[model samples]
Target: HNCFCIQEVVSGLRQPVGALHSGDGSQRLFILEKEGYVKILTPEGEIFKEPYLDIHKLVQSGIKGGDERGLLSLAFHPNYKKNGKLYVSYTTNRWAIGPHDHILRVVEYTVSRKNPHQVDLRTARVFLEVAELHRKHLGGQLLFGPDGFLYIILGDGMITLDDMEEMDGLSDFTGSVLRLDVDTDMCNVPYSIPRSNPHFNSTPEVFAHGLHDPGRCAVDRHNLTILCSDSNGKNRSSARILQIIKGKDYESEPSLLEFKPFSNGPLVGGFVYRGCQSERLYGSYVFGDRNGNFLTLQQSPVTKQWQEKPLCLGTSGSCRGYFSGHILGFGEDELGEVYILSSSKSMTQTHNGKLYKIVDPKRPLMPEECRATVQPAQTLTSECSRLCRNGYCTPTGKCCCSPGWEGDFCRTAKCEPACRHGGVCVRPNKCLCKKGYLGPQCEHHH
Candidate 1:
């Protein structure tokens, strides 16, 4: 039997939701705090004093106990070393549709050319936004798929607002996994739609739909498939892990694995154990609950059905006690090493959250392959400039329009009321209609 225990990496974190590596071969881990600060933890296990990025004034979350609205996930571009780009998923009321509504936004930021450790806030731009009417069920995991497209997981709006049957599932971005192209802009939008998107003709952004309160997800290293966990029903009684497929809707399909009914907390998604520490844990889906119950789902060789079991963390034979803190989420480093992010107190109540790497105590000496600082010391190959007039500079140092503007210099307006029938917008809210179309708003056809 394989046994595991936690090895502390860092502490003094406030409601940390996730941890991720840059994939730049830096060996540095980026930690996302629920209160809107992205801090850097060096390979030596020391957290930098200054935050890499901070948007606390713009973030709206942790109003009370159990409020899940906060900075939820972070993803560095796979070409991060060259592009110096990263994305963040967070909830805010800064430019909310309504005073009470929370707007979940996926914003892109570029790393500073002068200092690689800092992210320039001026380069920030909103790639997507979903207005959440209520606080419950905010699915905020942002990931870049193996296909090189950004995948966003958002939950079905408020559970009490209306019935799922009445909701327009197809047109709504809620309860769906949206995929976007960040490399270029199209259709007068800051981001483009990939030609392979399942809903290219209709929704254009939705890859899959019908998830409830999906807080965490991870890409399978072996199969290249995306897996996510959803907690649904009253008192968070039922939770399941879903294997997402292109254009597939889960409203009618049975879940791949349904976790035992729980009253303590919802499921926190994790990665499949691809790390070398444990041979028995390889390929098993490792996950846990908010109340610190660690578990795994393994498929049987004969039956081929998923079998759920407890993943105890303690000293040797006594691997039975729960984690001392609330498990906010899980993480995987560049080497596929998994880490747990947890806190002693719930949501913004205190700053006692900790980061831990899962390890097998049997191997007292750290494996050389598991070392963070590997060959090819982090290097920036691209020449990105410091200025982008009405936009931001790409890794190649080219200026890309920031949503409302377009063109080589980004001086042209894209318009709020989108132009129709190939019409162009010469100014904000004004459309220059096509040869056959007329009217300021482009409503007239002849």
Candidate 2:
């Protein structure tokens, strides 16, 4: 069942890339324009008189005058109400050298009470910085997970495609999704990395790796699942969405899901909808590609498989010539309704962007009434069945094997030995235990 329509909610944004709802329950929306301005849209869909926040000083100073390099990401602290802090990821200009492009920082900001729409410029604090030399793979996506920790996805940023080998280096922060303890102290800054981070001893923030250009990511706070989209440059056909399970000190291996050709091509911005709009998509993940397609995905109950549905077709606005960034980012309301930011020329010339909402006038999809039926037990008539003919008055039954045991119902001395050395038998039939273990039943304590 499908349930989504397109609504041109707001216009006149300059290449808006990322968006978010203000933490204060005030229906206000924040849009991060690529050219370096944060546009504010009230719940009523009216553009505010002034932007709710601005980092022109930080973003404008470093941009090299293009459509792709500027303020890229914005994230509100989970406890933004008390801390009044938010983070931004962007490219910076280097005065020491030429336009040294780099995804150089994550900055923090505090809201200004005097003017609720403005930020206290003096409150800008640098949280993390990347080296400027290799500025290409700056995977600059930052998010605050439901676990109250910050997750940063970085790109390989290799100057030359030949440098792709650097993607596997543990010392490098590029091409990785880093989990940090933002609640700890980073000197005078209000952010810190959690000591429990997997590589906290060496690089406290590094979490998982093997990413190319992670444009966007979302955390399923309820299930601790992280979904991200990767961009593959000229090799757009290889783009994919990855699912990672968040564990205590680290994230699990990524389960890559390939996008169909229609929603295929270089992907970037994406988000998961947790709203109550449609039963089919209430908790599904929706994402867009830079090529010209928006898609939604969810698991199928019957087949126990994932299903991908195309929602809308988009155009690669203003990304002609040497520039190639389109449909830059996505945002969602507190209610889980979805919005898209497009970079079509209809919005801005070199960097104008537009915002759209996914809507549907049709009735929501209803759930099916399919159920499986159970059958009654049958009487045994074969030799194997005769082994338990007397209702378990046999040798196998007399031995009394433990729970999760097996044998000819009531004969044959096939008792499973105890597991040893602290090993756990996840699947007793496949007794290939890990770490400290031995014996068959996994009953031996190490």
Candidate 3:
């Protein structure tokens, strides 16, 4: 099949905020919409008549209509297909007091048998909730790292409180990357806190703090390193990306490597390239800016120093200069091919958002590598792309899948089966069995 034509494979989506592949070998694609719904695009480019998951009512009630409020981040469990668990982060509606402030709330949900495209409202459970003192800095990105832990990013929730004062306090939840064990039993709900969480003794769920407005995060599976982008535009302020290593504490600090900006610009979403197609980008961490700049960074294999370099200018397709718009998110398929999402409200053109695939023009082609060889029989292309792009081994060859992906070619959903009743086939091959049908394959009769 032809994999080079962007036209045949690229279908336009509305305000596509986030994109991720179900980790099974099936190559299924899930896209998050800014309007509060999750759209499942089949491997064949067929749009589901209904959304795979709808939180419109819940999300609408919690929306703060500013530049960066509303439904934001989504991450499926590493065993999602088995567990059917995924997490979402968003700003909750102001509880009839003061203005509708921003808050970081992480919740888990299961697929509904009554509606495969929809999530069961009854199965929803809160994982973590951050108080939003202000509406502007609602850092709303949640990701599941390779270690099977959930990582959440939080904004400063407005600068009403001094940064110095907030950082000094042990109880502050703002500007942090929180880690938790969704499977723990310490909480009354379905989710639990990680025992090894950095601040578990003090805050119980905090992994790291000191973030301003974290827009996106990427984790490296091979090295267990995480890259997080900070979106702050204060005068004389510089945006930074923090690289955190797992299993290693930063001298009791949450962040291990803080990559400061050489220039005074805000950075948003980023990813560590593991794709075999690009030589220059092979191991570099590529990231974008809301103000229309793109940069690449390379961590010295020997020295371990992360060197940052500018890559693209303007928003998605701007020819003049880096356009002024918000860079929303970044994603990689099972094969490791990367994509970036850019959003804008003030652009001269009304292209609300755009997604672009990262490619290497001069890289040698691997035509001998069969798609089926790289991916499993029922897996989706996105899954194959993520695994191969991330330098993981698929059935065909060895390449890595991006963080949060597993299975052969990383096509299956990474979530474990959290469903207790029967659901049926509601999205792709994903089960949406009957009300009483639960278990891994919807075979259990409840």
Candidate 4:
């Protein structure tokens, strides 16, 4: 029991599903409810009455009939302190509005200059939108990669495991990790696409192809490698922790860690622990299932093989309490401390969801300090990792640049991308070599 403890920071959430910390120095926590509200929690754990954004009416978020659609992912701009920009990924009803009549949307919003805690919906800029089919499986998670690009997963319009043919058939934007250059605008769209996207320097926004619901993704703080969580398997062998290589086609297949499971609950992907709090957990990929079981995937120090284990000695999840099996996602603070967002299943439920700080009181909480910028903790696995010049190495021992930079060690410049124009066939890649461009792709410039 000394291994760790789960302290409930806040309760009374209207079916809270996710939690995130603003990368800014304020150290505030953002709790996302499935009912179309982004609520704020102080660093000391006090819930604010007024929400940062209340679109419960706009999106008709929260459980009404039987649909599980609503506000899902809430992410802040990496440069939030300066621009005050933030984004949300949620499902919206169609223009007509009916049961199962919805579409997925990614909207960009700004923090009000009048109030730092409030979201300025008047400045809401629609970025990405995808039509939906069935009401069940909506992969609406938003993440900013190490390269500063906004990435979102779009579920197949209609399909699941055993419905493989339908997933393969739909191709517009469903069934893959979509990347956007939120820092720059293209055409009328609020975000641009990085040159490193799929189709080899082309304009397609889908980063990788052939995925079902590759929902959860995390960026390594050390080398900046992108680790993704994929599930929906019939067996434990179905959940995957994969190293995402740009342009590589994937479908529920992972190279790093795969295990058999008892339930089909999706894997709530978490970050690689580069935090100072847990030494043994460092460099390991952490994750949890919809069944409320928390575990880590890393190489064993004693056996020298990849290992998986719960934080506690004998149990499956938090040592102090039990989850009702609605754990949505994990959270990592500036100090690398991880928090679990355990929620109730029904959207209309109250007092059933919670935000828990996963901690070991033995090791004091990573001290809080102020600085101009928050640096990701550095944890290297081997000599192959030590010599990274600019970019970092992947799990397979290959060096990689996040987006803008490039080289053998990912240190050179402009990771070699092409150009785009006209229809969806081409879009600008976000990078800088000499000018604010990657050479050839900047041809559209005056």
- lDDT for residue 367 in candidate 2, whole number 0-100: 22
Q: Evaluate model 3: give its TM-score.
A: 0.69
Q: Per-residue lDDT of 119-195 in model 3, one digit per residue for the tens? A: 66665666666656555767677777766777777776765555435543222567777776665522233455655
Residue 417 displacement in candidate 4 (angstroms): 43
Better candidate number, 1 or 2, judged by lDDT: 1
Instruction: Provide TM-scores for the models.
Output: 0.78, 0.67, 0.69, 0.69
Ten residues in a row with the worst lDDT in model 4?
419-428
- Ranking 1 against 4 by lDDT, winner: 1
lDDT of 2 by residue, 1-446 (tens): 24245557776677777678766556567888765778778776778777766667666433333235577678877755544556778776544422244446777665653455677666566667665445344667777766677777777665444443444222356667776666652223345556555555661566666676556775576625666666555555333444445544433334445553323665665677775554555666776676546676576788746566777433233211122335767887755567777775544564446687665444332224312232211222233223432221211112223345445453333225544455444443435456554456544446
Candidate 1: residue 13 lDDT (0-100): 89
**Per-model C-alpha lDDT, please?**
0.70, 0.58, 0.57, 0.60
Worst 10 residues of 3 by lDDT: 1-10
Which one wins on lDDT? Answer: 1
lDDT against true structure, model 1? 0.70
Error of 4 at 7 (Å): 0.8
Q: Please rank every candidate by TM-score, starting with the best.
A: 1, 3, 4, 2
Task: Indicate the TM-score of model 1.
Answer: 0.78
Ranking by lDDT: 1, 4, 2, 3
Candidate 4, 1-446: lDDT as tens digits: 44555666766676666777777777677888777888888765568789988888767564553365888788888767655677888888644432235678888776665677887677566777666667755777787776577777665555545434434332367666677777652223456556565553543776654455544665664513555555543323344333555444433323344444323355766666666666556676767666556666665679745555665523323445454446666766655667777665453354567677676655545544322253321222343344445432332334545455544564444424444332121212443334443244444434
After superposition, candidate 3 runs with Cα above 4 Å error: 1-12, 61-66, 94-102, 114-117, 162-171, 185-189, 237-251, 255-259, 301-304, 312-326, 346-352, 363-366, 370-446
